[PDB]
Design an enzyme around this catalytic site. Structure first.
Site, PDB file in Angstrom:
ATOM      1  N   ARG A   1       0.829  -1.166   0.000  1.00 47.31           N
ATOM      2  CA  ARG A   1       0.000   0.000   0.000  1.00 47.31           C
ATOM      3  C   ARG A   1       0.886   1.246   0.000  1.00 47.31           C
ATOM      4  NH1 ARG A   1      -1.050  -1.824   4.773  1.00 47.31           N
ATOM      5  NH2 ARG A   1      -1.010  -4.027   4.033  1.00 47.31           N
TER       6      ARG A   1
ATOM      7  N   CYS B   1       1.233 -23.122   2.262  1.00 47.17           N
ATOM      8  CA  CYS B   1       1.632 -22.053   3.193  1.00 47.17           C
ATOM      9  C   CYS B   1       2.437 -22.537   4.373  1.00 47.17           C
ATOM     10  CB  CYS B   1       0.432 -21.268   3.730  1.00 47.17           C
ATOM     11  SG  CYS B   1       0.898 -19.632   4.399  1.00 47.17           S
ATOM     12  N   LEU B   2       3.673 -22.065   4.506  1.00 46.30           N
ATOM     13  CA  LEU B   2       4.528 -22.470   5.591  1.00 46.30           C
ATOM     14  C   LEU B   2       4.022 -21.971   6.928  1.00 46.30           C
ATOM     15  CD1 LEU B   2       7.863 -21.832   3.842  1.00 46.30           C
ATOM     16  CD2 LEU B   2       6.988 -24.079   4.465  1.00 46.30           C
ATOM     17  N   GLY B   3       3.380 -20.805   6.915  1.00 43.77           N
ATOM     18  CA  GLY B   3       2.862 -20.196   8.142  1.00 43.77           C
ATOM     19  C   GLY B   3       1.528 -20.788   8.562  1.00 43.77           C
TER      20      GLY B   3
ATOM     21  N   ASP C   1      -0.724  -9.020   5.866  1.00 43.52           N
ATOM     22  CA  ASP C   1      -2.053  -8.753   5.279  1.00 43.52           C
ATOM     23  C   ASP C   1      -3.011  -9.947   5.416  1.00 43.52           C
ATOM     24  OD1 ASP C   1      -1.185  -6.589   2.390  1.00 43.52           O
ATOM     25  OD2 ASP C   1      -0.927  -6.350   4.572  1.00 43.52           O
TER      26      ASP C   1
HETATM   27  C1  HEM Z   1      -4.992 -16.780   7.042  1.00 44.93           C
HETATM   28  C2  HEM Z   1      -3.683 -16.974   7.020  1.00 44.93           C
HETATM   29  C3  HEM Z   1      -2.924 -17.236   5.762  1.00 44.93           C
HETATM   30  C4  HEM Z   1      -3.434 -17.620   4.448  1.00 44.93           C
HETATM   31  C5  HEM Z   1      -4.818 -17.758   3.910  1.00 44.93           C
HETATM   32  C6  HEM Z   1      -2.156 -17.773   3.732  1.00 44.93           C
HETATM   33  C7  HEM Z   1      -2.154 -18.215   2.379  1.00 44.93           C
HETATM   34  C8  HEM Z   1      -0.983 -18.639   1.667  1.00 44.93           C
HETATM   35  C9  HEM Z   1      -1.153 -19.252   0.336  1.00 44.93           C
HETATM   36  C10 HEM Z   1      -2.450 -19.493  -0.387  1.00 44.93           C
HETATM   37  C11 HEM Z   1       0.196 -19.527  -0.142  1.00 44.93           C
HETATM   38  C12 HEM Z   1       0.653 -20.166  -1.416  1.00 44.93           C
HETATM   39  C13 HEM Z   1       0.511 -19.237  -2.605  1.00 44.93           C
HETATM   40  C14 HEM Z   1       1.093 -19.969  -3.794  1.00 44.93           C
HETATM   41  O1  HEM Z   1       0.701 -21.143  -3.993  1.00 44.93           O
HETATM   42  O2  HEM Z   1       1.949 -19.389  -4.504  1.00 44.93           O
HETATM   43  C15 HEM Z   1       1.023 -19.055   0.969  1.00 44.93           C
HETATM   44  C16 HEM Z   1       2.432 -19.253   0.822  1.00 44.93           C
HETATM   45  C17 HEM Z   1       3.320 -18.751   1.816  1.00 44.93           C
HETATM   46  N1  HEM Z   1       2.878 -18.274   2.994  1.00 44.93           N
HETATM   47 FE1  HEM Z   1       0.968 -17.584   3.675  1.00 44.93          FE
HETATM   48  N2  HEM Z   1      -0.998 -17.665   4.401  1.00 44.93           N
HETATM   49  C18 HEM Z   1      -1.446 -17.251   5.598  1.00 44.93           C
HETATM   50  C19 HEM Z   1      -0.541 -17.126   6.706  1.00 44.93           C
HETATM   51  C20 HEM Z   1       0.902 -17.085   6.549  1.00 44.93           C
HETATM   52  C21 HEM Z   1       1.735 -16.706   7.724  1.00 44.93           C
HETATM   53  C22 HEM Z   1       1.220 -16.242   9.067  1.00 44.93           C
HETATM   54  C23 HEM Z   1       3.102 -16.778   7.174  1.00 44.93           C
HETATM   55  C24 HEM Z   1       4.343 -16.390   7.877  1.00 44.93           C
HETATM   56  C25 HEM Z   1       4.554 -16.868   9.091  1.00 44.93           C
HETATM   57  C26 HEM Z   1       2.994 -17.251   5.774  1.00 44.93           C
HETATM   58  C27 HEM Z   1       4.160 -17.474   4.917  1.00 44.93           C
HETATM   59  C28 HEM Z   1       4.076 -18.014   3.562  1.00 44.93           C
HETATM   60  C29 HEM Z   1       5.297 -18.485   2.856  1.00 44.93           C
HETATM   61  C30 HEM Z   1       6.742 -18.419   3.258  1.00 44.93           C
HETATM   62  C31 HEM Z   1       4.747 -19.083   1.648  1.00 44.93           C
HETATM   63  C32 HEM Z   1       5.453 -19.652   0.419  1.00 44.93           C
HETATM   64  C33 HEM Z   1       5.749 -21.158   0.448  1.00 44.93           C
HETATM   65  C34 HEM Z   1       6.517 -21.562  -0.816  1.00 44.93           C
HETATM   66  O3  HEM Z   1       6.556 -20.747  -1.771  1.00 44.93           O
HETATM   67  O4  HEM Z   1       7.102 -22.682  -0.852  1.00 44.93           O
HETATM   68  N3  HEM Z   1       1.641 -17.729   5.469  1.00 44.93           N
HETATM   69  N4  HEM Z   1       0.328 -18.766   2.235  1.00 44.93           N
END
Ligand code: HEM
Ligand SMILES: CC1(C)[C@@H]2CC[C@@]1(C)C(=O)C2
EC number: 1.14.15.1
Length: 403
Positions: free
Chosen positions: A173, A344-346, A238
């Site tokens: 943003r 998603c790692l998180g 976000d």
């Molecule tokens: C409601 C909570 C959350 C949702 C809906 C969400 C959703 C996502 C989604 C859909 C992807 C994969 C996108 C793709 O396929 O390219 C993603 C990847 C990622 N998320 Fe988030 N996430 C959330 C929370 C978080 C949190 C809290 C962290 C950090 C602690 C995080 C860190 C990442 C990372 C590092 C990846 C990439 C994994 C890779 O590329 O191998 N996720 N998450």
């Protein structure tokens, strides 16, 4: 306006949907994408906005594509075709390896240990709101919460938030002070010295663990380090803020459901899972690595395909009355955290953040509603979200629990 149709697209497939700005936004952002899940609408369609891309409208095809990493590259996950984080654009020896590393700093065991301090924090943030009888939940809880928690996780000082939070704000943003390039650079500027410092020494904190990671038995480069840290930070901002918000938006609109949980707080698990389905929020894509016929459609190399995580889970073929929130839904199905090699790692951290938020909130503020006469406004994107959540409540009816 709309970019010209390329020669390989059948007119009967066109269906112009601006992911950045959908027709029914006023209904709510999901409802607005759900237009792509009306009956007459093909399972896989093409729109001319945003440069022209594909869009799989149904769960099966979404899953299938993230499963199919060879055909569906994560070189450009963003529509339109800017950025350089690890580990999204990376293939497959290194990939699993980096994912392991991170999983090491945010995996379940780590979250389990943190829950305690996460609890404390949510509790202080709620308590400082509790007396007021109102608030913009989005600005007053949701935004301050995930940033702080990364600070906890990476063992950083509270005193860095304002400036750090500034940089991540500029990434998604901009106010115009900094280009996307500048805000990233500066992020790194702040990160590097802590990495080196802590590569030397070895701590338990997230940066320390990442900093001393091998990859191909070789030590992780500083350049590599700041990037992973980079996405760990902004990845969990976000999405959580925004999601916490839909979830608070709905609890506040619905005293019944709000009651289900005040009475039986052990339902919160499945509840949270069901809201993750109901209010999924992320819409990412992939890019074709060469021509490929898919579910009866000719995809062209270099093409880009939206593969909306939001969609599965709202697809009727996968959940019944997808638009109805039932905490006792037997089989909750969603790709809210994505699918296939990039999942998603998180994801684990996120759940706990939600669950804590919800438990620690309701146990303290059982009764709340939208501020009289305010229309909640959604926005659409790679990450969809809520502009504001003006809430209110009679303070008498709250309770203070301490630590
Ligand atoms: C409601 C909570 C959350 C949702 C809906 C969400 C959703 C996502 C989604 C859909 C992807 C994969 C996108 C793709 O396929 O390219 C993603 C990847 C990622 N998320 Fe988030 N996430 C959330 C929370 C978080 C949190 C809290 C962290 C950090 C602690 C995080 C860190 C990442 C990372 C590092 C990846 C990439 C994994 C890779 O590329 O191998 N996720 N998450
Ligand atoms: C766009 C995202 C927020 C989503 C989770 C982390 C992120 C930066 C991605 O690469 C997918």
């Amino acid at each position: 306006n709309l970019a010209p149709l390329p020669p390989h697209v059948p007119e009967h497939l066109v269906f112009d949907f601006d992911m950045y700005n959908p027709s029914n936004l006023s209904a709510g952002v999901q409802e607005a994408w759900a237009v792509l899940q009306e009956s007459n609408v093909p399972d896989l369609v093409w729109t001319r906005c945003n440069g022209g891309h594909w869009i799989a409208t149904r769960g099966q095809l979404i899953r299938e594509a993230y499963e199919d990493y060879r055909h569906f590259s994560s070189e450009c996950p963003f529509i339109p075709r800017a950025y350089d984080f690890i580990p999204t654009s990376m293939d497959p020896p290194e990939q699993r390896q980096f994912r392991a590393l991170a999983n090491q700093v945010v995996g379940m065991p780590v979250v389990d240990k943190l829950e305690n301090r996460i609890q404390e924090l949510a509790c202080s943030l709620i308590e400082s709101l509790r007396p007021q009888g109102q608030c913009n939940f989005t600005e007053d809880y949701a935004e301050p919460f995930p940033i702080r928690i990364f600070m906890l996780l990476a063992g950083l000082p509270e005193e860095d938030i304002p400036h750090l939070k500034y940089l991540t704000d500029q990434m998604t943003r901009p106010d115009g002070s900094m280009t996307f390039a500048e805000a990233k650079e500066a992020l790194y500027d702040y990160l590097i010295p802590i990495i080196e410092q802590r590569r030397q020494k070895p701590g338990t904190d997230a940066i320390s663990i990442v900093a001393n990671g091998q990859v191909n038995g070789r030590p992780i480069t500083s350049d590599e380090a700041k990037r992973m840290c980079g996405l760990l930070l902004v990845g969990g901002l976000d999405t959580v803020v925004n999601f916490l918000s839909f979830s608070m938006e709905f609890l506040a609109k619905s005293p019944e459901h709000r009651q289900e949980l005040i009475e039986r707080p052990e339902r919160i698990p499945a509840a949270c899972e069901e809201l993750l389905r109901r209010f999924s929020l992320v819409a990412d894509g992939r890019i074709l690595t060469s021509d490929y016929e898919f579910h009866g459609v000719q995809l062209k190399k270099g093409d880009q395909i939206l593969l909306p995580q939001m969609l599965s889970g709202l697809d009727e073929r996968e959940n019944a009355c997808p638009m109805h929130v039932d905490f006792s839904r037997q089989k909750v199905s969603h790709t809210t955290f994505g699918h296939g090699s990039h999942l998603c790692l998180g994801q684990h951290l996120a759940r706990r953040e939600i669950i804590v938020t919800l438990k620690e909130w309701l146990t303290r503020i059982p009764d709340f509603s939208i501020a009289p006469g305010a229309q909640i406004q959604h926005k659409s994107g790679i990450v969809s979200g809520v502009q504001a959540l003006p809430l209110v409540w009679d303070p008498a009816t709250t309770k203070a629990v301490h630590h």
